[PDB]
Amino acid sequence: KQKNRPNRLIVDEAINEDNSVVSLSQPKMDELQLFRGDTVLLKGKKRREAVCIVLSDDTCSDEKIRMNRVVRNNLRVRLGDVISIQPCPDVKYGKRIHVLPIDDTVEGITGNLFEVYLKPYFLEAYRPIRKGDIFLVHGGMRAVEFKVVETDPSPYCIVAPDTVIHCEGEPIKREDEEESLNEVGYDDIGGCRKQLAQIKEMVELPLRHPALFKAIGVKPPRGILLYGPPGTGKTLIARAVANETGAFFFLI
Amino acid sequence: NRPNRLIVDEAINEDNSVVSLSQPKMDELQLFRGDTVLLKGKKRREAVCIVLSDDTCSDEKIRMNRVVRNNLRVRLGDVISIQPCPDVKYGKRIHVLPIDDTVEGITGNLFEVYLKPYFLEAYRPIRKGDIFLVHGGMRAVEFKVVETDPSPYCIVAPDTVIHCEGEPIKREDEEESLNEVGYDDIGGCRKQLAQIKEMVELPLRHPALFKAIGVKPPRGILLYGPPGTGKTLIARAVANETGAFFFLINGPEIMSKLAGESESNLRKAFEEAEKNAPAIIFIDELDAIAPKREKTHGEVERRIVSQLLTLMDGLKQRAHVIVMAATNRPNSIDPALRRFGRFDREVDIGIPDATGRLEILQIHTKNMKLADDVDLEQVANETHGHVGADLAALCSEAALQAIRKKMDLIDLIDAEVMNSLAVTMDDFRWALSQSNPSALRETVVEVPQVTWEDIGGLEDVKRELQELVQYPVEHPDKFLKFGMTPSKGVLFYGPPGCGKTLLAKAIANECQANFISIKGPELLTMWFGESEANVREIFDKARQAAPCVLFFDELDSIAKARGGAADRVINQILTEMDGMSTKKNVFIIGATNRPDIIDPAILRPGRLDQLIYIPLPDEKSRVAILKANLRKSPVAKDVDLEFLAKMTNGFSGADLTEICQRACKLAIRESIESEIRRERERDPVPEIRRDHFEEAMRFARRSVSDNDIRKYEMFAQTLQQSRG
Ligand SMILES: Nc1ncnc2c1ncn2[C@@H]1O[C@H](COP(=O)(O)OP(=O)(O)O)[C@@H](O)[C@H]1O
Ligand SMILES: Nc1ncnc2c1ncn2[C@@H]1O[C@H](COP(=O)(O)OP(=O)(O)O)[C@@H](O)[C@H]1O
Ligand SMILES: Nc1ncnc2c1ncn2[C@@H]1O[C@H](COP(=O)(O)OP(=O)(O)O)[C@@H](O)[C@H]1O
Asked: Which residues get modified to Phosphoserine (chain A)?
C-alpha cells in the first residue's frame, strides 16, 4: 500500500455555495485519476456514502478537501475529523427519482413543489446523488431541504433531463435511514480476495486497453471457468465485475 | 572455411532485386542463374535477391545496391551469408504502406503509377520490413512491406493482388500483419517436420512422379498428440510455403448444422477443393466427427462418418489431393477409419523437449521487445513438460503481470513504453508458479543427456551394452555378416539403483535415440485397474520411435504386491514382447530388486537372454559421483575427496548424493542464519565445511542388507558362467 492511506482527507470550509460540489487540489486529482468534470464516491462516518463531482480549486490545501455544511451534515461529521474519497467513473443516468421534503421545511407553504423547487434545481444541472442525500433547495424566499427516497439506479445516479421526479404527498420524516435494497459491487463480494484479485486483474486489463493486447499479440483471458459449490456468489461475482468495470453484461 | 561468408560491395545494376556474384562461387553453392538465395544481415534482417553472374565481381565479394545494404542493416565493409533456397514461390496477397517522409507533394492513385510498372513481369522477391525505392514523376518513393502471405519465401507474381491503402504507418503497435505463415513460426518438432515434409512435399511441384510410383504414397496423414502443440499451426505452416488451397474446417462446425445440411458442406467442401489443382485440406478435431462405434448413440453421426468414408474412398488419386487430419489418440477414433490405403501413416508429434521449449520461447519472444536481462535458457530446465500453448500462455501471463507490476500511464501507451518490457528471472518464475502442467500425465518422449558421468564402474558390462545397443545403431550389417539376431531384452538386478536408469539414459544418449521410461507405479496402476489395452498404446507409441529405448522398473513388484509370476500385465508383457520386430533396435531394458520372485517365462532363452548383476558402487571411483555432485551445489575447494573415500566402504550412490545435498541444506540454513544475523545487525559463504561432511557421515548408513547380498551371490552362483 501507500503511506497513511492517502485517500483519507481533512474536511474544510469551501468557497463555492453548491451543495453537490467538493473541492480538491491540482496534484491530488492527478494522482487520484480525477478530471475536472468527473464524478466520485465520497465515504465517511456512520457508514454513510455520498456522490459528488470534484472541481478544481486553487485555495484548497494539499491534504484537505473543501466542502460546505450540507455534505458535512450528510456524512454526519463535524469540523476536525477524517473522511475518505473513492473514484466513481461508471455512473449511469437516472430514470425515476422520488423526493420527499422534511416536515418542518414545508410548514406554511402549499402547492406544487416540482415547478418551484425541483425544476429550477435540476434544470440541466446533472447533480449526482445517492440514496439518502438531503439536499437544500432554495426558492420562494425560503430554504427547503429535499431527501432522496428511491432511484431506479438504486445505489447511485445522475439526474438526467428525461428523469421523472416524484414528489407525491404525505412525505416521510427524519428517521434512522434504514437500507433495504441495493445493487451489488466489490464490497458486496465476500471473502475471495486471493482469487478476486486475480480475476480483477484478468478483467481490468481488458478494460480500456485495446493496444495492450496488441502488445501481447494474443488476449490471455479467452475463457474463464469459475467452479465451486452451488451458490458461492457466482453470478454476484459476474455482475460485480461488470458494473464497476463498465460494460454490457447480458447474462444467459 | 565456410565459403557462404561474402563481402558487401557496390552493385553494377541499378535494380534492388539483383545481386552480382562470380561464376566459380555460383557452381560451388549449387545455384542456378535465377536462383533465390537467403541473404542474412545485421539486426536479424534478411532479404532475397536474384543472383546474376558478373565478370567484374570478386569471388569472395558480393555486389548489392544501397537499398539492399540499408535493408540488411550493414555498411560498406560488413559480411553477409548465403543459403541455397529453391522453394521461394509466388504470393497471394501483398499489403504495402509507404513511409511518410517520401510521400509529400503527390496526391492521387499511386497503384497504376508506382506499384504496377515496378512489378511488371520482373519476379522480384521481398521480405517483411523491406524498404525499396520506387522512382517516377521526377521523384523517388520509399515503400515498406507490411505483410505477404508467403512471408519468409515470396516472389512478387503478376497474379498477386497488391493492397495499396494509402496511409502512413502509425507510431504504435497497430501493424496490419496477422497470422500469415511460418516455418519460423513452428516451434520445436524438426525431427517430425522433416518426415511430414518428406511425405507431402512430393505432391508439391512434381506431377511427373505418378508414372513411376503407380499409386501416390500419401492419401492422408493423421497428426495425433496431446492438445496444445499446433495441429493447425503445423497445417497452416505446411500450407502457403507450398502454395495451395488450405481450406481449414472444424468438426464442431460440421456437427453444428441441422439435419439435411450436416450432410451438406462435405461434398461441397471437397468439390470446392476440386476446383483447385492441389489440396492440403485439414479437418480440426476429427475425433469428434468419428468416435468409436460403441460411443455413438445417435445415427446422424454415423451418417457423417459414412459420408467421410465415401469421400475418402471416392477421392482416389483425383489430381494429387491430400487430406490432412488430427486427433488425440489412435484408439480414440473409429478403428474402421484406419483402413489401409487412406489415413495410413499416423505420424506422431509428441511433447517438445527442453531445446524445443527453448526455441518455442525464443520464437514467441522474437516479436515482443525483450529487455535482454534474461537469458531464458534455464527456464525450460525447471519445467518437466509444458505444451506449446501453455508456453504461449506463459509468455502472455508473464508480460501481463510485468505490465501490471509497473503503474498505469497518464491516460488510456506509446511503442517505446511497450518496448519497456523489463521481464526478470522472478517475473518468469512467478509466471511458472502461476501455471499448470496440462500434459504432465502424458509420457514424455525425449533424448537424455547423462553422457557417461554417474557410473565410474561396470567396465565390461558397459562394453557389452555398447556392443549390444550402440554397435547395431552405427552399423547393423555386421550381424547379417555372420547371422546374428540381436537379443533386445536385458535385465539389471541386485540392490536397488537409479544408476541403471542413468546407464540406460547414457546408452540412449550415445545412440541419440528417444528414451521412454515406463514407470513401475504406472504398471501397478494398470494392474489394479486391469486396463491391459494401455500397454498396447505404449507399444504403439514405442514402435513409432525408431530406434527407441524402452525401460521397465521393478517388474518383481507386481508379483510382490499381487493381493487381489502370473499377472494381467505380465502375460500382456510376454505377449507384446513376443510380438516384436527383430529390427528397429527397440531394445527393452529391465530393472528389478528381487530376482527370486520373477516370471519364469521371461528368464527363458529367447527374448531376454543376458542377465547381469549390478554390484555395489566403487568407493575408489567416488570421484565421478562427487563430479556429479559438482553440479547442483558445486562444492568449493580445500576439501578432501579421500575423506569421503576413507570411511565410506559400502554406502549407496544416491544415498551419498542426497547426504551431500543434506550437507548442502546445512550450508543453506547456515547461509540463512548469516543473512538473519546480518539483518539483525541493523556473503553467503558458498564454501562447504568439513563439519557438514562429518555430520553427513554420522547421519548416513547403508541400505545394504547382508542376507540380500548373499542371496545375490547365490543368484550369481546359480547362474555361474565363469572361465575355467
Ligand atoms: N458469497 C456471497 N456473499 C454474499 N451473498 C451471497 C454469496 N453467495 C450467495 N449470496 C446470496 O445468495 C443469493 C443468490 O446467490 P447465488 O446462490 O450465488 O446465485 P447463483 O447460484 O446463481 O450464483 C444472492 O441474493 C446473494 O445475496
Ligand atoms: N507456437 C505456437 N503458437 C501459437 N499457437 C500454438 C503454438 N503451439 C501450439 N499452438 C496451438 O495449439 C493448438 C492445439 O494443437 P494440438 O491439438 O496440440 O495439435 P496436435 O495435433 O499436434 O495435438 C492449436 O490450435 C494451436 O493454435
Ligand atoms: N546394483 C546396485 N547395487 C548398489 N548400488 C547401486 C546399484 N545400482 C545402482 N546403484 C547406485 O545406488 C544408487 C541408489 O539408487 P536409488 O535411487 O536409491 O534406487 P531407486 O531408483 O530404485 O530408488 C544409484 O544412484 C546408483 O548410483
From this structure: 20
B218 upstream amide cis, omega within 30 of 0: no
The Cα-based distances of B263 to B280, B283, B378, B704 in angstroms read 22, 16, 51, 70
Residues A70, A75, A81, A83, Cα dihedral to 10°: -110
Strands A8-12 and A49-56: unpaired
Considering only the beta carbons, identify the residue of A201, A208, A216 that sits closest to B399: A216
CB B281 within 8 A of CB B246: yes
Q: How far is CA B132 from CA A227, B142, B158, B494, in A?
A: 55, 6, 18, 72
Q: Are B514 and B473 in contact (CB under 8 A)?
A: no
Torsion (CA) B155, B161, B162, B166 in degrees, nearest 10? -170
Give Cα B568 to chain centroid, integer Å: 35
Residue A218 near chain B (CB below 8 Å): yes
d(CA A212, CA B418) in angstroms, rounded, equals 8
Q: Could you tell me the resolution of this structure in angstroms?
A: 4.5
**Among A31, A194, A212, the residue to mutate for chain B (most B Cβ within 10 A):** A212
**Taking CB atoms and an 8 Å limit, are A214 and B174 in contact across chains?**
yes
Any idea which residue has 558478373 for its cell? B54
CA–CA gap between residue B652 and residue B662 (Å, rounded) = 15
- Name the residue of A236, A249, A251 whose CB sits within 8 Å of the most ligand 1 atoms, as the mutation to test its pocket: A236
Collapsed DSSP state (helix, strand, coil) of residue B94: strand
Q: How far apart are CA B320 and CA B305, in angstroms?
A: 23
How many CA atoms lie within 13 Å of B133's alpha carbon, on the beta-carbon side?
16
Contact B131, B66 (CB under 8 A): no
Which residues make Cβ contacts (< 8 Å) with residue B431, sequence separation at least 6?
B394, B395, B397, B398, B401
- Measured CA to CA, the distance from residue A52 to residue A21 in angstroms comes to 6
CA R_g for chain B: 32
**A residues 182-201 near B, CB within 8 Å?**
201
C-alpha cell at B113: 503509377
